[PDB]
Amino acid sequence: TWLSDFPQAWAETGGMGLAVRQAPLIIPLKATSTPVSIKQYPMSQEARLGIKPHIQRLLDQGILVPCQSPWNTPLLPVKKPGTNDYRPVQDLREVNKRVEDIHPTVPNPYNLLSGLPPSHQWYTVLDLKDAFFCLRLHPTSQPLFAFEWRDPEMGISGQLTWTRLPQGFKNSPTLFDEALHRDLADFRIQHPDLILLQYVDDLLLAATSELDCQQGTRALLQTLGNLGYRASAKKAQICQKQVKYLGYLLK
Amino acid sequence: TWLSDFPQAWAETGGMGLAVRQAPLIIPLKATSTPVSIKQYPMSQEARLGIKPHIQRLLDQGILVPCQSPWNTPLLPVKKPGTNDYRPVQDLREVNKRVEDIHPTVPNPYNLLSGLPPSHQWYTVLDLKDAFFCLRLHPTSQPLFAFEWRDPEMGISGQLTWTRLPQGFKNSPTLFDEALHRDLADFRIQHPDLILLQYVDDLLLAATSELDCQQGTRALLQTLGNLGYRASAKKAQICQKQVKYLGYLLK
């Protein structure tokens, strides 16, 4: 019923998310930074065929697009045999160095976790799937993240870049945490007897009874689905007196 | 023979390293930062027993020591069942925010990899085991990394801190890369017909023939062992015409 009552809230039934209320992000560069182009080492036939399916799927969904940029960072085949199903990892160290640091406004989640009232002993734990891919990058900031993808067989010979917040980018955890926090401000305001804790893509809802936890979890799944986020149905812990959150056992 | 000729160069035969020429590091804090103490959530009997063996071994080797600090960051049980062999991970986000950024002086390794002459076609690839643990922290900077460990059964009730560069600290990769680079400057100077590339704890030696690669690899293992670094014998690729470095196939 959790699956069928809220089909848009789950990665399994609702596809990839897209945070609808979040405007495409602009990434500020340090005032004196210049674009940097790092060399891409020729990939072997085997790593290229292990990686191409991920590149195909991302392209298909609009998550990667062709571009021309003065920036370039290397792609690495994160490792199997050859031809044999690998995955692509981008080394963004040189972009990370040139971008302004963004630090958090949210209250520290560990400190909040320790101040949880004992009246609140029913919990739901959710984790969001592919959370950074829910946030769009503004066209003016997409060039920063380009890499080279030469696959004449694929008919792509040039650079590709990310249209969503990429993994490996130093500010992605903070940028996603701040955006979701702001997106869930209405839920928190509307449900004063529930406590919602979050840390990047890990969420904890706590309530005073099983029935209040059940309704607060339904309202939260309705809200997340509508906002464009997707939880993993395979990992969810719903209305329990004992749960693991952040690896900690709450009981 | 590689194992028996150079017993101090390998993690397997030579123990944990300690870089002998490297002075204990002082970690500069941002001029306006203040110590911060984050709350530690009570660990369950089961995560505590899964984690205690790692804490015991580290204590035994002097890598962790008891202390009293105004700084504190949480320890998380990175996850199994209960009692069941987990591992400890420290969340250093709040210290990472308060420490000055250190950026590299070394030339970019990907760019160097692409400028490798074709005359150089015999290679050895080594990766250093527990490389950050080879570098010591100065006593004045050890307090930054404290965490709470209350195990009255162990007879430890208070904080512990790292005496070596910890994992999770934002500058550790750069600090280790810069130190090893400087430590191997004499080898590079003494063997002008060999090319040594490095990126944090991954090393590539390239030479013009099999015999020159063999002798340069012996000299490099002798040097690393003497400097206090330890390579992983289980991963090494020695004197080959085809190797994988950084996931890239060189052939």
XYZ file of C-alpha atoms in Angstrom:
502
model
C 0.000 0.000 0.000
C 2.975 2.244 0.656
C 3.973 1.631 -2.927
C 0.581 1.904 -4.537
C -0.663 4.872 -2.439
C 2.349 7.045 -3.374
C 3.751 5.974 -6.762
C 5.503 9.272 -7.409
C 7.383 9.241 -4.071
C 9.491 6.173 -4.850
C 12.450 5.763 -7.152
C 11.100 2.314 -8.086
C 7.706 3.534 -9.337
C 8.197 7.235 -10.009
C 11.341 7.501 -12.128
C 14.265 9.855 -11.634
C 13.401 12.958 -9.631
C 13.555 16.607 -10.556
C 13.074 19.145 -7.779
C 10.349 21.336 -9.287
C 10.607 24.315 -6.914
C 14.379 24.550 -7.178
C 15.723 27.059 -9.736
C 18.709 25.892 -11.771
C 21.833 26.538 -9.756
C 24.554 29.059 -10.608
C 28.017 27.988 -9.299
C 30.202 30.950 -8.278
C 33.856 30.825 -9.173
C 36.645 32.429 -7.155
C 37.159 36.007 -8.471
C 40.612 35.181 -9.892
C 40.087 31.618 -11.248
C 40.600 30.747 -14.897
C 39.225 27.770 -16.842
C 41.595 24.851 -16.838
C 41.795 22.029 -19.370
C 43.273 18.729 -18.188
C 44.375 16.002 -20.608
C 42.209 12.957 -21.135
C 44.207 9.688 -21.376
C 42.971 7.442 -24.179
C 40.646 4.796 -22.901
C 40.962 1.172 -23.954
C 38.296 -0.542 -26.084
C 37.311 -2.478 -22.981
C 36.808 0.333 -20.481
C 34.993 2.345 -23.180
C 32.453 -0.470 -23.690
C 32.026 -0.953 -19.974
C 31.326 2.775 -19.534
C 29.265 3.534 -22.668
C 25.972 2.150 -21.270
C 26.056 4.653 -18.397
C 26.866 7.466 -20.752
C 24.028 6.341 -23.041
C 21.430 6.257 -20.277
C 22.480 9.632 -18.863
C 22.419 11.213 -22.337
C 18.976 9.738 -22.956
C 17.636 11.298 -19.767
C 19.145 14.712 -20.508
C 21.553 14.466 -17.533
C 24.572 14.765 -19.833
C 24.621 16.937 -22.943
C 27.165 17.707 -25.643
C 29.006 20.978 -25.272
C 32.125 22.937 -26.024
C 33.975 24.278 -22.946
C 37.341 25.798 -22.045
C 37.203 23.619 -18.942
C 38.040 19.906 -19.047
C 38.541 17.246 -16.335
C 39.460 13.616 -16.801
C 37.157 10.660 -16.766
C 38.471 7.425 -15.176
C 37.168 3.860 -15.771
C 36.419 2.673 -12.272
C 37.511 -0.748 -12.819
C 36.662 -4.293 -13.852
C 38.249 -6.503 -16.509
C 38.019 -5.089 -20.047
C 34.780 -4.596 -22.052
C 33.513 -5.725 -18.697
C 31.043 -3.527 -16.863
C 32.981 -0.709 -15.171
C 31.683 2.757 -14.242
C 32.783 6.315 -15.002
C 34.220 8.549 -12.293
C 35.260 12.169 -13.034
C 38.210 13.672 -11.125
C 37.014 17.212 -10.302
C 39.912 18.241 -8.129
C 40.886 21.145 -10.444
C 37.381 22.571 -10.579
C 36.900 22.066 -6.850
C 40.001 24.293 -6.275
C 38.564 27.180 -8.318
C 35.060 27.335 -6.944
C 33.943 29.340 -3.952
C 33.243 27.392 -0.785
C 29.635 27.274 0.301
C 28.910 26.555 3.891
C 25.808 25.409 5.588
C 23.094 27.338 7.308
C 21.210 24.280 8.635
C 21.649 23.215 12.287
C 24.020 20.295 12.864
C 22.092 17.027 12.561
C 24.081 15.120 15.209
C 23.352 17.757 17.816
C 19.651 17.668 16.872
C 19.624 13.882 17.040
C 20.830 14.038 20.599
C 18.144 16.572 21.632
C 15.210 14.374 20.497
C 12.455 14.242 23.147
C 11.682 10.775 24.498
C 7.991 11.336 23.864
C 8.906 10.853 20.194
C 9.459 7.137 19.809
C 7.940 6.036 16.511
C 10.140 6.591 13.516
C 10.305 6.422 9.756
C 13.716 6.512 7.970
C 13.979 7.306 4.268
C 16.902 7.875 1.969
C 16.599 9.715 -1.305
C 17.884 7.983 -4.436
C 20.171 9.920 -6.817
C 19.445 13.073 -4.819
C 21.997 15.358 -6.519
C 20.499 14.588 -9.964
C 17.244 16.275 -8.729
C 18.906 19.670 -8.789
C 19.524 21.410 -12.151
C 22.562 23.440 -13.079
C 22.056 26.733 -14.833
C 23.362 26.760 -18.440
C 26.011 29.297 -17.511
C 27.497 26.935 -14.938
C 27.272 23.669 -16.975
C 30.608 24.328 -18.798
C 32.604 23.984 -15.596
C 31.987 20.210 -15.509
C 32.785 19.167 -19.090
C 34.820 16.097 -19.936
C 35.834 14.542 -23.243
C 33.898 11.656 -24.755
C 35.108 10.531 -28.146
C 33.040 7.591 -29.346
C 32.765 7.825 -33.155
C 30.893 4.570 -33.029
C 28.354 6.380 -30.760
C 28.551 9.339 -33.053
C 29.795 11.621 -30.217
C 33.180 13.260 -30.785
C 33.845 16.059 -28.315
C 32.919 17.080 -24.765
C 29.895 16.271 -22.663
C 28.789 18.141 -19.519
C 26.303 17.659 -16.654
C 22.941 19.367 -16.566
C 22.454 18.338 -12.935
C 24.627 18.684 -9.781
C 27.431 16.136 -10.267
C 28.938 13.710 -7.818
C 32.539 14.543 -6.891
C 31.828 18.271 -6.782
C 32.846 19.592 -3.377
C 29.714 21.656 -2.734
C 27.125 19.124 -3.883
C 26.326 17.684 -0.421
C 25.818 21.143 1.039
C 23.883 22.493 -1.920
C 21.527 19.509 -1.805
C 21.110 19.648 1.968
C 20.237 23.372 1.858
C 17.744 22.979 -1.008
C 15.862 20.073 0.552
C 15.841 21.798 3.934
C 14.123 24.836 2.359
C 11.774 22.654 0.346
C 10.586 20.830 3.502
C 10.110 24.016 5.555
C 6.376 23.992 4.699
C 5.994 20.394 5.854
C 7.760 21.164 9.145
C 5.606 24.265 9.729
C 2.398 22.344 8.926
C 3.152 19.414 11.231
C 4.322 20.883 14.498
C 3.925 17.661 16.516
C 6.283 15.711 14.254
C 10.073 16.086 14.206
C 11.875 15.775 10.880
C 15.656 15.464 10.910
C 17.756 15.411 7.709
C 21.356 15.131 6.598
C 21.861 15.466 2.867
C 19.781 12.552 1.533
C 19.019 10.759 4.799
C 15.777 11.642 6.556
C 14.279 10.789 9.913
C 10.676 11.448 10.910
C 9.796 10.875 14.590
C 6.302 10.965 16.138
C 4.574 10.314 19.441
C 2.413 7.265 18.402
C 2.181 4.685 15.704
C -0.915 6.292 14.218
C 0.632 9.760 14.132
C 3.798 8.300 12.605
C 1.714 6.564 9.922
C -0.157 9.694 8.899
C 2.987 11.914 9.092
C 4.803 9.356 6.864
C 1.935 9.429 4.343
C 1.965 13.262 4.300
C 5.747 13.244 3.933
C 5.657 10.772 0.983
C 2.904 12.849 -0.661
C 5.006 15.996 -0.193
C 8.338 14.492 -1.370
C 6.674 13.027 -4.508
C 5.083 16.361 -5.341
C 8.291 18.310 -4.791
C 10.075 15.999 -7.245
C 12.216 13.921 -4.848
C 12.279 10.118 -4.827
C 12.863 7.801 -1.858
C 14.252 4.314 -2.063
C 11.468 1.803 -1.311
C 14.079 -0.930 -0.993
C 15.720 0.805 1.977
C 12.806 2.539 3.771
C 12.073 1.873 7.444
C 8.443 2.859 8.080
C 6.704 3.398 11.418
C 8.992 1.436 13.707
C 10.032 1.747 17.312
C 13.525 0.730 16.294
C 15.389 2.081 13.306
C 18.932 2.785 12.130
C 19.654 6.360 11.116
C 23.155 7.509 10.143
C 24.216 3.997 11.216
C 22.975 4.743 14.757
C 20.366 2.445 16.296
C 17.451 4.422 17.724
C 15.445 2.292 20.085
C 62.734 -12.492 -4.541
C 60.904 -9.182 -4.656
C 59.609 -10.006 -1.213
C 62.773 -11.387 0.289
C 65.160 -8.812 -1.270
C 63.207 -5.847 0.165
C 61.370 -6.889 3.347
C 61.027 -3.349 4.660
C 59.415 -2.023 1.447
C 56.245 -4.105 1.726
C 53.276 -3.740 4.024
C 53.129 -7.550 4.251
C 56.680 -8.013 5.575
C 57.653 -4.609 6.939
C 54.788 -3.529 9.189
C 53.041 -0.171 9.251
C 55.128 2.658 7.824
C 56.382 5.835 9.413
C 57.925 8.447 7.138
C 61.231 9.075 8.920
C 62.252 12.299 7.150
C 58.867 13.940 7.597
C 58.517 16.255 10.623
C 55.238 15.998 12.520
C 52.697 18.177 10.780
C 51.151 21.358 12.187
C 47.599 21.993 10.835
C 46.790 25.707 10.464
C 43.348 26.862 11.458
C 41.490 29.774 9.880
C 42.370 32.956 11.854
C 38.818 33.303 13.228
C 37.853 29.635 13.881
C 36.900 28.376 17.323
C 36.923 24.795 18.630
C 33.600 23.094 18.176
C 32.214 20.161 20.148
C 29.607 17.986 18.434
C 27.433 15.513 20.348
C 28.210 11.822 20.219
C 25.083 9.614 19.928
C 25.232 6.588 22.218
C 26.380 3.528 20.385
C 24.629 0.192 20.761
C 26.327 -2.792 22.434
C 26.591 -4.349 18.991
C 28.251 -1.550 17.037
C 30.604 -0.948 19.991
C 31.816 -4.575 19.874
C 32.161 -4.490 16.119
C 34.282 -1.324 16.349
C 36.355 -2.028 19.488
C 38.892 -4.306 17.734
C 39.906 -1.487 15.380
C 40.174 0.930 18.243
C 42.255 -1.620 20.175
C 44.715 -2.203 17.346
C 45.127 1.512 16.622
C 45.671 2.270 20.322
C 48.233 -0.523 20.527
C 50.198 0.947 17.633
C 50.121 4.478 19.049
C 47.925 5.751 16.174
C 45.180 6.778 18.603
C 45.867 8.180 22.060
C 43.728 9.371 24.951
C 43.332 13.110 25.262
C 41.205 15.959 26.481
C 40.147 18.461 23.778
C 37.683 21.318 23.302
C 37.074 19.874 19.847
C 34.845 16.836 19.295
C 33.446 15.136 16.160
C 31.160 12.139 15.981
C 32.119 8.580 15.312
C 29.704 6.474 13.203
C 29.482 2.640 13.078
C 29.838 1.924 9.394
C 27.472 -0.832 9.339
C 26.824 -4.550 9.667
C 24.397 -6.411 11.928
C 25.029 -5.882 15.654
C 28.123 -7.078 17.591
C 28.972 -7.972 14.039
C 32.174 -6.619 12.550
C 31.562 -3.008 11.484
C 34.149 -0.221 11.163
C 34.504 3.276 12.609
C 34.162 6.353 10.417
C 34.597 9.886 11.854
C 32.548 12.750 10.370
C 35.066 15.624 10.171
C 32.888 18.088 8.337
C 33.043 20.659 11.185
C 36.819 20.545 11.447
C 37.205 20.591 7.674
C 35.250 23.920 7.640
C 37.624 25.581 10.124
C 40.958 24.601 8.670
C 42.885 26.523 6.061
C 42.886 25.079 2.563
C 46.197 23.759 1.337
C 46.718 23.490 -2.348
C 49.185 21.556 -4.345
C 52.502 22.548 -5.780
C 53.085 19.300 -7.721
C 52.404 19.187 -11.488
C 49.101 17.592 -12.504
C 49.580 13.835 -12.884
C 47.106 13.386 -15.761
C 48.909 15.959 -17.861
C 52.240 14.253 -17.092
C 50.788 10.861 -17.958
C 49.875 12.133 -21.378
C 53.378 13.555 -22.026
C 55.170 10.214 -21.430
C 57.751 9.505 -24.162
C 57.154 6.328 -26.160
C 60.742 5.269 -25.574
C 59.572 4.513 -22.024
C 57.592 1.311 -22.312
C 58.431 -0.886 -19.335
C 56.512 -0.078 -16.207
C 56.151 -0.861 -12.540
C 52.983 0.227 -10.640
C 52.911 0.361 -6.847
C 50.360 1.594 -4.373
C 51.235 2.528 -0.829
C 49.256 0.892 1.974
C 47.822 3.094 4.758
C 49.801 6.021 3.351
C 48.287 8.766 5.540
C 49.230 6.847 8.724
C 52.930 7.320 7.698
C 52.732 11.020 8.449
C 52.717 12.209 12.095
C 50.686 15.057 13.498
C 52.374 17.502 15.810
C 51.047 17.372 19.407
C 49.642 20.868 19.065
C 47.448 19.798 16.158
C 46.297 16.389 17.546
C 43.419 17.954 19.585
C 41.572 19.018 16.454
C 40.663 15.392 15.647
C 39.384 14.102 19.000
C 36.278 11.977 19.341
C 34.611 10.362 22.340
C 35.201 6.722 23.217
C 33.519 5.556 26.385
C 34.220 1.874 26.941
C 34.420 1.273 30.714
C 34.870 -2.372 29.917
C 37.999 -1.317 27.927
C 38.891 1.003 30.733
C 38.750 4.072 28.417
C 36.260 6.771 29.408
C 36.840 10.011 27.525
C 38.226 11.224 24.192
C 40.769 9.699 21.863
C 42.638 11.532 19.080
C 44.844 10.653 16.083
C 48.607 10.890 16.184
C 48.790 10.444 12.409
C 47.048 12.190 9.459
C 43.453 10.904 9.572
C 41.211 9.761 6.776
C 38.263 12.094 6.156
C 40.382 15.196 6.712
C 40.094 17.414 3.651
C 43.807 18.166 3.283
C 45.150 14.657 3.844
C 45.452 13.686 0.147
C 47.330 16.874 -0.666
C 49.526 16.785 2.415
C 50.526 13.193 1.660
C 51.107 13.853 -2.034
C 53.365 16.846 -1.271
C 55.393 14.985 1.376
C 56.043 11.917 -0.766
C 56.868 14.089 -3.769
C 59.578 15.861 -1.726
C 60.805 12.602 -0.242
C 61.302 11.076 -3.724
C 63.067 14.141 -5.169
C 66.457 12.497 -4.475
C 65.442 9.318 -6.289
C 64.246 11.313 -9.311
C 67.464 13.372 -9.393
C 69.629 10.234 -9.082
C 67.875 8.316 -11.859
C 67.500 10.703 -14.750
C 66.679 8.016 -17.343
C 63.661 6.765 -15.393
C 60.323 8.580 -15.132
C 58.418 8.391 -11.854
C 54.821 9.599 -11.797
C 52.748 9.782 -8.584
C 49.287 10.735 -7.407
C 48.812 10.545 -3.662
C 49.531 6.857 -2.970
C 49.653 5.547 -6.538
C 53.046 5.396 -8.224
C 54.216 4.661 -11.735
C 57.824 4.027 -12.730
C 58.549 3.846 -16.483
C 61.855 2.844 -18.119
C 63.314 2.191 -21.549
C 64.065 -1.596 -21.176
C 63.164 -4.511 -19.012
C 66.583 -4.551 -17.374
C 66.518 -0.835 -16.589
C 62.977 -1.193 -15.238
C 64.109 -4.070 -13.004
C 67.018 -2.172 -11.492
C 65.005 1.097 -11.152
C 62.248 -0.909 -9.368
C 64.817 -2.433 -6.988
C 66.290 1.025 -6.236
C 62.793 2.423 -5.734
C 61.794 -0.385 -3.298
C 65.076 0.104 -1.404
C 64.395 3.850 -1.202
C 60.698 3.582 -0.197
C 61.534 1.030 2.550
C 64.271 3.257 3.924
C 62.108 6.373 3.866
C 59.468 4.536 5.917
C 56.777 3.946 3.260
C 55.229 0.546 2.539
C 53.898 -0.763 -0.783
C 51.246 -3.399 -1.173
C 52.850 -6.614 -2.483
C 49.390 -7.995 -3.201
C 48.675 -5.239 -5.734
C 52.102 -4.487 -7.286
C 52.654 -4.695 -11.044
C 56.402 -5.112 -11.625
C 58.339 -4.691 -14.868
C 55.554 -5.138 -17.392
C 54.857 -3.783 -20.835
C 51.209 -3.519 -19.890
C 49.912 -2.124 -16.636
C 46.886 -0.318 -15.215
C 47.586 3.000 -13.531
C 44.781 5.228 -12.229
C 42.469 2.677 -13.892
C 44.038 3.518 -17.278
C 45.593 0.708 -19.314
C 49.103 1.611 -20.462
C 50.201 -0.658 -23.251
